[PDB]
Amino acid sequence: VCNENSLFKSLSRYLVRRKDPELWGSVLLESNPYRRPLIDQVVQTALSETQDPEEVSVTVKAFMTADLPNELIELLEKIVLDNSVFSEHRNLQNLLILTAIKADRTRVMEYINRLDNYDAPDIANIAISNELFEEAFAIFRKF
Amino acid sequence: PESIRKWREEQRKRLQELDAASKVTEQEWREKAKKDLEEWNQRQSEQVEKNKINNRIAD
Amino acid sequence: ELEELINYYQDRGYFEELITMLEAALGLERAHMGMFTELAILYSKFKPQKMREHLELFWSRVNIPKVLRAAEQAHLWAELVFLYDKYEEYDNAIITMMNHPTDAWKEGQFKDIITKV
């Protein structure tokens, strides 16, 4: 019924209350006309609750199993990193790292100076897979 | 009887003027904005060269 | 049917009859938004100057899509921006001021509403 037209913030709230990753995937049918539209508001609205990360986690798990490519998952990474209340880096930074791997854009460079509290070996492996051939050793000594 | 044509042509030509009105307005805005920079940079360069010839005596 | 009476008019070129029958159609207390939707629609059709103010009142009630459509049919962008505002349709206001500034351009309002992109 909402699909026609509605306050889709309400539907996103149902989502953040309907802990139904399968229903998320139902929303993630990849074929609905409003799908790009709907996601456009669901992202700008997910910021509303900012009190529990449970539905956050189930939504990102859905993202994983829905294998939503770049411009589908990491966009939420971006929106949430904006003064993240859950200011951990696990499942965010690492999960930003994987998105960066899938993206391989200039953004990945300033990722470092944007966040903190990471580990070396992962980014060392990726950077030797990336442009950084001896910056690996320089970061061994550096960061 | 497809009598829409009257008001239809009316509104069509109305917009067909409004466009050109908007365009001459944006053009005048463009040129006046250019004039702003042109009156700005002259004074910038003036003061720059002034302090430059005043202060080169060191390095 | 009310739309079908509309058709029952425009078929004969009863655009004036459309006007007249809307002239007292405002006398309502039990209907819903679609009436006002059509009202602004036929405004845009013939008397587009009047939907602005009234629109600026009943706006809280009417659907999104038909409004978007009729607003386009107006091709009155200095208004469409205000409408996007009412539906907080930022991106649209942005592109429209880009393509239709000198009609729709508002400076500080835009420079503050920009932060939602």
Place this chain on the structure above:
Amino acid sequence: ELEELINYYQDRGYFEELITMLEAALGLERAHMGMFTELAILYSKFKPQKMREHLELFWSRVNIPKVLRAAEQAHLWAELVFLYDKYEEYDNAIITMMNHPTDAWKEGQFKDIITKV
């Protein structure tokens, strides 16, 4: 503890200095409404022609009596009406708009706003 600083300023004649301090305060981050209130206050005593244009913004960030008294010290009547629009206190808006129509009256709003008392 900065209100007393304002007092310090104006008593010490630091009027332009305190308005500059206002300009400083214009971009704070973790501020309650009282900031904006005293902002409007100093506008009233110094920048009325700026006041209302600023007040177009933080309607949702207001205390009633402070801004009431400031406004009435300015008694910028149309601005008082705008206040009432945000606070839904129709009576006095009507009072003024009657005793101050020329400066402060519009027919459109008057056409319906009366129905609320």
Place this chain on the structure above:
Amino acid sequence: IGGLLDVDCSEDVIKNLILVVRGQFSTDELVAEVEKRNRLKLLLPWLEARIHEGCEEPATHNALAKIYIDSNNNPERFLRENPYYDSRVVGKYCEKRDPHLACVAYERGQCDLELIN
């Protein structure tokens, strides 16, 4: 830990130590410490840990609420879902801060006299 309250030491050291064995141990005192410090950040993740373990110490819930107040927000449901702090204190804190939060607190707190006052 007395001296930790006393010290105003370097920054990371707390986050480093918090896991240590206990001594003379409370919480409603170190809260007073950070209130002198205005540096809520300290235990926020540790507070998360402690609470999601299931400690129904209102001051903890109260500490939660305080940092939330600090976080420029409205935890209407969070304070709502939490009949484990004291609605009275969480209301009476934000007197100058926000009528809405204290009022809905009294709502869930049934603070009738306080609603009045």
